[PDB]
RNA sequence: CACAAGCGGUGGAGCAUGUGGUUUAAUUCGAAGCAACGCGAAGAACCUUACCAGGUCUUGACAUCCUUUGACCACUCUAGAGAUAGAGCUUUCCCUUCGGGGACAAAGUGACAGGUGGUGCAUGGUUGUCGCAACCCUUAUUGUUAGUUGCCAUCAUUUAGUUGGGCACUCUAGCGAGACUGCCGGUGACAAACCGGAGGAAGGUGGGGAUGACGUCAAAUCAUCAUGCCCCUUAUGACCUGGGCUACACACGUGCUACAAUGGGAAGUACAACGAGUCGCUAGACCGCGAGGUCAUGCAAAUCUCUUAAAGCUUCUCUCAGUUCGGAUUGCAGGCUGCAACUCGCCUGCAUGAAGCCGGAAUCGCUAGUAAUCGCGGAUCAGCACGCCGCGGUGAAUACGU
């Protein structure tokens, strides 16, 4: 705002796995406040992960998150009438925000016959350095570390 | 018998809970809690006070609930179970107090104002 | 238009209804009968300076009480005018009526009386600047925490309208426990209509 | 050929493929298939030549053909050739039921 | 014309579905409450002055 | 939908009953656009007021359930 | 029990006042009057446009509450009927005695 | 919530509705950037109704006076689209000292009435827009007084809180308590204030409402009502039937339903709150595929009814397609209110099955029980709501910075 920084919106760790990350993942799949559907979807997807060439849904999910999250994002700014873009660092909460966002967005566009057949498949493809999510990360890193040219003294 | 009674409120729903020594089970409105709130996992929200303090059994729980929806009248049940546990031994008012589990949630439905579409959503605008 | 009616903001908080009866399934008839009554007795009021009127009613009788400042000039010589009031009001209401006349003390500390009097000077070609000033002067001498007046319309019997009033002492309007009074009257000199408003603060 | 009129589709159940003949909606297909005793079983048309002739002879008792288009056509034809306020509108591409023409003709007039 | 129409309103109507309400102070035909027989903006005027018994300003 | 008997007006039905005897006249001039076309109105020529004038309409047989107002429009477009 | 009261009013002050009047003048000559039980206070709501010609998007809302009160009498006596049907005060409060 | 970070929209498609434009016998009048455009209207088939076309009246549809005087009616039958006119039993002294007064038809009789006709730039009154805190209301916790029509923990009983019993619990509603930077640590001129802790249901104006200064826009309204001046008066007044106000080469605003699998269809199982009811809300049983109908029952209401909420959950299907998506448009047959649904109502069934596969420039709403999504009630009202006012259910993302 204008007055100054604000709080961080504490979350309630889901009771099944006792992991706040699964809570945020449930919150991102959910649309229109229909939360039980989102919960059923995430649990069916994790069942599908473990049953087929899996070890545990938390482990492969964390690794997929690690492989997707970005570390260098740029910001397109305005100075006095000419606009450019400059890289900057990335604070931690924004990182997991972006990770979840990309994974869900690009699983929603897969093209199979169930959101589970999409989500489980996509985060498996992600934990093996594949999938449009990882390519989105690398597009970001390539835009950065190039557009540092008109950023070196910003 | 001995028994312990508490009252729990949340979001237009009020519950009357009774603690009774037993083997660990809960029935509500003459039905089983697996069938009354069979949603997915709200039961793991209900059994939280037993999980934090007086760990963890064994009490049969009998409750009488009315009002609100299926998700309101389970937070209300949790409220009541916590109060009843407090009644058993007053030494629990610290472990429970740390983890919420003792306060009433005063988040009610905000009232609608005139000239507005909802409590805060306004109509669509056009500068010209 | 940006002020609430000061005796409608306070009704049901520190003051009461000027009509105290409870009825259901006979409510429209009663409300219009009260309206008829009160719109009639503005006949004697034209001379006798009545301020309020309180309508109560029982099984079939109607209990009335009026606040005036002229007790004899409203009841008659030995009681020959209240007789007429009752025998006339029976012709409307078709019931039994019983006027119980009150008398008002300190009449210069009343919104309707003051404003209606200082709206009768305007009709007799009097300048307004001293009518309001003498009004608040004779309202403060009775002992009052504050008073405020305001006249509006074509002033002096002239062209385009304007407005102006004068204040004396404090008149807090936002305080709910304030017991303020208010009234709005009219008059003409020869051009259009004028509006006179008056507020008096009498402690709480 | 196939079972009525022409060409009831393949690969679908009968309760749905029977919809494709002009004059058979959804409850009519149910009633026809019930007056005989044929189910769906399961998501295919693998009938018999007794089931095809069964569900073929009963459709003959309805107006499901180019015998129905004639009826509808000559109805609107009788409408527009007496007065007629409804037919006058039928002849202009304008809503014929009372529709306050501000947008409600994009369907009726393109 | 609003003095002949109040007269025409009070005579018995020619058919069942021809009667209609009006205000009683004025003759406004739009938005009248049929518990009071008062229109939209005589209600707001007699509620102040505390003449209608019952009614007062609401807030919650 | 007056399945409790269709609706004519008395004046209109009186006039048509009165002419039911012989060959008919074009002077049946009524306002009455709410009435339906009973199966006895055939061959006559009713005049139907459309808010401005009295339009004549000749009653064939295909028009036997409709109303008398369906044959005298009121709007005048182009 | 073969005698009972009902009182409606717009002011709970006057309501409780008159209820205490009847309860006191009942237990003075008899006994066992069930307390003045409170009933759930009906409410209505009236929304109106506060301008004579335009501006629908600004309104003013009114209401009218109606307080209720119940009293049942147990074992009356040929003096309670008398000492009850006579007291009448005050004006704007509804009284309805059903056997 | 002015940008920034976000979530869902509008602009594309069909339909509802308001406005411009054109058209017409009339498409009645008002509102015009923000601050006009689901606005006056919280209910246009007749009425409403001001507008138009035909048929009619002139002290008058409505008020006072004065005189003859005085009790006026309603009902029936012919003509008429009605307005009206012509005939039939008759409007018939309710104060009496013999001497009067209330209601009223006609007439006379003229004073007079009548105007939604003009002037918001002549005005009153009533609003929009820029836009102190406390005392009042509601919501979050509890003591006490009171237990019926509410409630059922310790007991028997049945279909059941029902009937015996009880007022413990919930609930209802009167009266009180409780939140004050009030204590504890640091920052800071030791000050005000800010950051952290304890205790508590609640912590820093706890959440929301009512409450709108002096003034600005000759802002809006002579059509809520009043009113100065001007205008009409066998007509700009008044009565009746039928027609517009709903017209359609188009342009703009506000909404609803969708373009599907986080879905469509079939069967089973659950959980609210605010409100309304006497010629009204309809229990129950039966008839109809259905909307509905018949006989009948309780209730002027914590007692009966409207009222088994819908999203939700569990099974069985369907398989990425202009389709078992979507439901516009048209044909036929019905129901309900009403004297009467052609212009011009709502609902039912069978048949038909359009555009539309997430929408450019540009632009909107919102900081938490909020946004998004789902139903329920009622004012107005014979009937008629995608609009308006309220109620509750499930329930997010983000705010580095100016
Ligand atoms: Zn009025």
Numbering used by the authors:
A (entry chain g): 2 to 155
B (entry chain i): 3 to 130
C (entry chain c): 2 to 205
D (entry chain m): 2 to 111
E (entry chain n): 2 to 61
F (entry chain s): 4 to 81
G (entry chain j): 4 to 102
What does the paper say about this structure?
Ribosomes are the ribonucleoprotein machines responsible for protein synthesis. Here, our goal was to investigate the structural conservation of the Enterococcus faecalis ribosome compared to Escherichia coli, a model organism for structure-based development of ribosome-targeting compounds. In the analysis of the E. faecalis 70S ribosome structure determined by cryo-electron microscopy (cryo-EM) to a global resolution of 2.8 Å, we find that structural differences are located predominantly in peripheral regions, while the organization of the functional centres and antibiotic binding sites remains conserved. The cryo-EM structure of E. faecalis 70S ribosome presented here revealed that the architecture of functional centres and subunit interfaces remain conserved when compared with E. coli and S. aureus.
Structure determination by cryo-EM using multi-body refinement produced molecular maps that reached 2.8 Å for the 50S subunit, 3.0 Å for the 30S body domain, and 3.2 Å for the 30S head domain by gold-standard Fourier shell correlation. These maps were used to generate models for the 30S head and body domain and the 50S subunit. In the 16S rRNA, larger structural variations are located in solvent-exposed and peripheral sections of the beak (rRNA helix h33a), the spur (h6) and the body (h7, h10 and h44). Motions described by eigenvector 2 include a stationary 30S body and 23-degree rotation of the 30S head with respect to the 30S body.
